[PDB]
């Protein structure tokens, strides 16, 4: 339904304070603000400096010297008109914090102050979160206090399912091979279970998953004796959890890990980070200076002593990791956009949990590094000079990577497909990276979509002032406002990336590129771009999100699988039969209601208009149309009804109600009675077949009323009785007056008794008598509450739900299901984009060790972070010549004839071409009959295509992909690559 409300709408209790407004602070604050909260208050009195601009995207060079908190407030306020953003004048004593519900301490707050603030917040009942980033390293800490309760651990919809058989002992088996989807320890309640009476009262039962299609409950002989049927519903029971203070946790930390392969490092960095503060204490507030071995070894000593002070952090016999801590010291001053964005999303989500009560908080420490982003030191040496500052905004990126690698980032040539949420966060990361900022680099962003608001000013590059303009253009200009070094380097196109645009995005375009990044949702665009990147052998950076879940995938030429090779299966489609007659879920009734909307208010009007304007309409429709009867019946009914007053629109809606929720249902029960037995001998209405009861119209039932209201209004639109103008807050009296005086025809079960088409056409009126008559078809606009569309779908679905005893759904939930609205939240978007930009570094160094790359998955509900080595491309072999099934191909010069191609493959490779196709067109087959084969075998590919498609090549083409099947030297079938014909 909605995202999260009712008892979980505590975010309008919640005032958030963020201390420190460098890159980490702004990333966090931006995400929170976009999400929505009662208030955001920020605090950073320190003056802006050039270096700060490494990741702090809201700061400009005009601001240098001013307070960060002052110069960021206005820009954060822009983000959400419903969220007030303040600045804490001063933080002089801890009690000033009592006015806030969550306090966040970022990298600008000393550990001494973090311990003080946290002791105060914990003992005072205030939620505390802290976060820090140190080059390619980072951490976060959560402390929501003594008695936090998890009421919605995962946020996902409660699992439900239909029961087939339950014994005296537990063992609940499902219906017709269905997953329950439950894990061990879950709890479930039951409904509609016949026999076991009080087993349906709401009592919970612990679930032992003994199979993927069954589970155990216990003894159920006391509730009754199972008869038939039933449904189970998961319920999430509360979980009480305790957080320890920061001081308790410093010596006894509880970790949430970020990477399977790096479990140990978390205990090391936990010490390291501490030592960093200990270092700053001794060195007048400074961190270890960059790539400096003196400070590095001082840090190793500080950690080595801290180990003895905190033996439980490493345990017994575990040594300190010199090299890890050494790198921590080397990178202490670093400010890396990817790491900062990652922790921004992660930490912002933790803040939102602390505000809302939703999901499962992090408990309590998490550490993270991305050291494999480091280039080959051979390629790019790292020492105190190469890494030294240069009086630029990129100085704290140079601190980690060195000036030469950073220059290579500047001189990269990159293609970004899509300027949506992820696309915008990507352009932001790239702006902060100075990517494509050198003289030999550039960026190309392309999106043919327009801007339109979501809910409470989502999207941190688009504003109300921007509605209607292109996404790519506005995003490019916004990030140029953040970093002028990219002014005139962003090529913002508005083209679609597919077959229809291959002369814009051509050989030259693609071969110039260093790599590609995809920021698009739909599977078609994604597979196309992926196959382009396979063709041109380019690296591709893929990402996706689904609410609190997200993933990143790297596609490396000659090395890894492609995106299409591993893409997920699309969503289940509703079986036609269940849809038409046997719904058991609100999804079915919603889909059926949508169909009915289409037919009532869009299709019928279009058909009437065609019949009135076109002169051969009837003749043509007879010639070429599958559903002739449907079209003509639609027209004739539309024209035989003819409402002259809104009174008649109300009457029409009421009669449609009777037809669909009384008569049609009675006809269905006529065909198959409630106790009708199948030929099998069992009941017809078993399992997912719920026997309906016909409805009796009741104007005080909300769904009946709103069906009549919405249908009458939309028909009034069709027949011009009211345009987009009607006081749409109706009274039952107005409609009840009309409806009580109607005669409702009784149910006539039509068992009463070329040929029918001629009667239809005889019925149709003469258009000359309908002179100047037009129907205005509706267009389904879901994001407009005035128009009655969602009202109609909700009420229609809910009346059908009443028929089959399916529980109703409100407008917002119906809108969610009917729109297939996929959630997009700021936290996950920023986080996943950060991880992509961390793998980008590996592309810059042209890495070819597959162990260096990281495919990522996250679920911020749990929270879970996981990374996995990309999958190697599958490889084969046909004549002892081994090959790469994804990336390898055959290459052929010139517009060769088909016979020469076949002969060339028999000679050079030993292959017997059995099939050959170009795109969708089959050009040659082994089983083709003689007459067919002769006309083709002697043709050039271009003319071969002209023959099959009867359309010549556009001429802008220089290359051609051809798929083939073939046998080997033995005559048996072997798998083989594709062929590139270069014209």
């Amino acid at each position: 339904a909605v995202l999260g409300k009712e008892a979980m709408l505590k975010m309008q209790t919640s005032n958030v304070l963020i201390l420190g407004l460098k890159g980490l602070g702004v990333e966090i604050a931006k995400n929170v603000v976009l999400a929505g909260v009662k208030s955001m208050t920020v605090f950073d009195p320190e003056p802006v400096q050039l270096a700060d601009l490494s990741t702090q995207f809201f700061l400009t060079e005009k601001d240098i010297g001013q307070k960060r908190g002052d110069v960021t407030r206005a820009k954060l306020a822009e983000l959400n008109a419903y969220v007030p953003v303040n600045v804490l004048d001063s933080l002089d004593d801890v009690t000033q914090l009592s006015q806030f519900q969550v306090v966040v301490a970022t990298d600008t707050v000393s550990l001494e102050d973090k311990v003080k603030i946290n002791e105060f917040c914990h003992s005072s009942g205030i939620r505390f979160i802290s976060s820090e980033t140190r080059g390619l390293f980072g951490n976060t800490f959560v402390d929501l206090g003594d008695e936090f309760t998890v009421l919605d651990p995962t946020g996902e919809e409660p699992r439900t399912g239909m029961v087939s058989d339950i014994e005296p002992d537990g063992t609940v088996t499902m219906l017709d091979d269905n997953r329950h989807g439950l894990e061990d320890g879950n709890f479930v309640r039951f409904s509609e279970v016949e026999g076991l009476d009080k087993l349906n009262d709401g009592t919970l039962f612990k679930v032992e998953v003994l199979g993927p299609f069954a589970f155990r409950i216990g003894s159920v002989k006391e509730y009754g004796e199972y008869k038939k049927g039933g449904i189970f519903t998961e319920v999430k029971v509360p979980r009480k959890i305790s957080f320890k203070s920061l001081k308790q946790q410093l010596s006894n930390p509880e970790f949430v890990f970020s990477d399977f392969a790096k479990f140990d490092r978390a205990a090391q960095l936990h010490l390291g980070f501490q030592a960093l503060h200990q270092f700053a204490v001794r060195h007048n507030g400074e961190l270890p200076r960059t790539m400096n071995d003196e400070d590095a070894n001082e840090l190793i000593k500080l950690v080595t002593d801290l180990s003895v002070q905190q033996p439980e952090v490493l345990g017994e016999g575990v040594d300190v990791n010199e090299d890890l801590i050494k790198e921590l010291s080397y990178q202490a001053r670093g400010d890396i956009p990817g790491v900062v964005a990652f922790f921004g999303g992660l930490v912002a989500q933790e803040v939102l949990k602390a505000c809302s009560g939703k999901f499962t908080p992090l408990k309590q420490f998490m550490y993270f590094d991305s050291l494999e982003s480091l280039p080959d030191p051979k390629n790019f040496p790292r020492n105190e000079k190469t890494t030294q500052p240069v009086n630029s905004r990129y100085d704290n990126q140079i601190a980690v990577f060195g000036l030469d690698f950073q220059k290579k980032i500047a001189n990269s040539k990159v293609f970004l497909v899509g300027s949506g949420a992820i696309g915008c966060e990507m352009l932001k990361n790239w702006a902060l990276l100075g990517l494509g900022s050198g003289s030999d680099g550039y960026i190309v962003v392309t999106d043919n979509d327009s801007i339109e608001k979501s809910n409470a000013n989502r999207q941190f590059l688009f504003r109300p002032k921007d509605v209607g303009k292109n996404k790519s253009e506005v995003a490019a200009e916004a990030v140029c406002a953040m970093n002028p070094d990219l002014k005139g380097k962003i090529n913002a196109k508005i083209d679609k990336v597919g077959p229809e645009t291959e002369e814009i995005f051509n050989d030259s375009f693609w071969e110039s590129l260093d790599f590609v990044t995809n920021a698009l949702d739909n599977v078609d665009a994604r597979t196309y771009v992926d196959r382009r990147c396979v063709f041109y052998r380019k690296p591709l950076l893929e990402s996706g999100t689904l609410g609190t879940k997200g993933n990143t995938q790297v596609i490396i030429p000659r090395l890894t699988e492609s995106y299409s090779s591993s893409r997920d299966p699309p969503e289940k489609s509703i079986p036609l039969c269940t849809l038409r007659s046997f719904p058991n879920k609100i999804d079915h009734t919603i889909a059926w209601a949508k169909s009915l909307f289409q037919g009532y208010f869009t299709d019928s009007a279009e058909n009437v208009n065609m019949y009135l304007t076109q002169p051969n309409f009837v003749e043509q429709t007879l010639k070429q149309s599958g559903d002739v009867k449907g079209v003509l019946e639609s027209i004739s009914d539309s024209l035989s009804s003819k409402p002259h007053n809104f009174e008649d629109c109300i009457k029409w809606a009421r009669l449609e109600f009777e037809k669909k929720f009384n008569h049609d249902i009675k006809q269905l029960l006529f065909n198959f009675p409630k106790d009708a037995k199948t030929s099998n001998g069992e009941p017809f209405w078993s399992g997912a077949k719920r026997a309906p009861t016909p409805l009796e119209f009741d104007i005080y039932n909300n769904d009946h009323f709103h069906f009549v209201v919405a249908g009458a209004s939309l028909r009034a639109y069709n027949y011009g009785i009211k345009s987009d103008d009607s006081n749409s807050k109706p009274n039952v009296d107005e409609y009840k007056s009309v409806i009580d005086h109607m005669i409702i025809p009784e149910f006539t079960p039509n068992a009463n008794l070329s040929d029918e088409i001629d009667q239809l056409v005889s019925s149709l009126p003469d258009p000359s008598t309908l002179a100047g008559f037009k129907l205005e078809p509706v267009d389904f606009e879901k994001d407009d509450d005035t128009n009655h569309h969602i009202e109609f779908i909700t009420a229609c679905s809910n009346c059908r739900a009443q028929n089959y005893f399916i529980e109703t759904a409100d407008r917002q939930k119906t809108k969610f299901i009917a729109g297939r609205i996929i959630p997009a939240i700021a936290t996950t978007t920023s986080l996943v984009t950060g991880l992509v930009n961390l793998e980008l570094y590996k592309l810059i160094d042209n890495k070819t060790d597959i162990e260096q790359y990281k495919n990522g998955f996250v679920n911020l509900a749990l929270p879970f972070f996981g990374f996995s080595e990309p999958i190697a491309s599958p490889k084969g072999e046909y004549n002892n010549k081994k090959y790469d099934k994804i990336w390898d191909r055959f290459d052929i010069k010139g517009d060769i004839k088909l016979s020469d191609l076949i002969e060339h493959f028999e000679k050079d490779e030993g292959l017997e071409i059995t099939m050959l196709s170009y795109g969708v067109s089959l050009l040659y087959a082994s089983f083709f009959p003689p007459k067919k084969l002769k006309e083709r075998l002697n043709l050039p590919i271009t003319q071969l295509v002209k023959l099959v498609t009867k359309k010549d090549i556009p001429a802008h083409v220089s290359t051609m992909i051809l798929e083939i099947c073939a046998d080997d030297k033995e005559g048996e079938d072997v798998e083989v690559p594709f062929i590139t014909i270069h014209l």
Partner: protein
């Protein structure tokens, strides 16, 4: 999931002529490998046994992650086929993966003809006829077979 749609289609077409299924033909359009013309013989010892039935088959953008689309062209009296050619088929709906192929869909349709299922009906009238008036419904299926389907060799 396969890296290329037309490659998959080629692989299936070659094997359809190489190793055909009895009583079924399936051949694509040269200028569109995504459209298949199909015919199925009525199974022996069924109402449809003297007829040959025409079907269109289509492969969507995301095949083989997505099941084929199928529609009867021959008018047919069947509990699970409606007037516009639409079919309720257990393979089409819930059970689909890259592992299944056009072959399996055609086998399933052939079997639906052999063994109709009015218990899970699409054409509700024909289902009523089949449950209450089985022998008569079967006889109407025979009549329609010779009336509308093409005859066997």
């Amino acid at each position: 999931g396969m890296a290329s749609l037309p490659k998959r289609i080629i692989k299936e077409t070659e094997k359809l002529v190489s190793d055909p299924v009895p009583g079924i033909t399936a051949e694509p359009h040269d200028d569109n490998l995504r459209y298949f013309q199909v015919t199925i013989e009525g199974p022996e010892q069924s109402p449809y046994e003297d007829g040959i039935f025409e079907l269109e088959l289509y492969l969507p953008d995301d095949y083989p992650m997505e099941a084929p689309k199928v529609r009867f062209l021959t008018k047919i009296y069947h509990p699970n086929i409606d007037r516009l050619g639409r079919i309720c088929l257990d393979v089409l709906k819930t059970n689909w993966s890259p592992a299944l192929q056009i072959r399996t869909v055609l086998l399933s349709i052939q079997a639906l003809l052999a063994s109709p299922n009015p218990n899970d009906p699409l054409a509700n009238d024909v289902a009523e006829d089949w449950i209450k008036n089985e022998q008569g419904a079967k006889a109407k299926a025979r009549e329609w077979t010779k009336l509308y389907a093409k005859k066997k060799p």
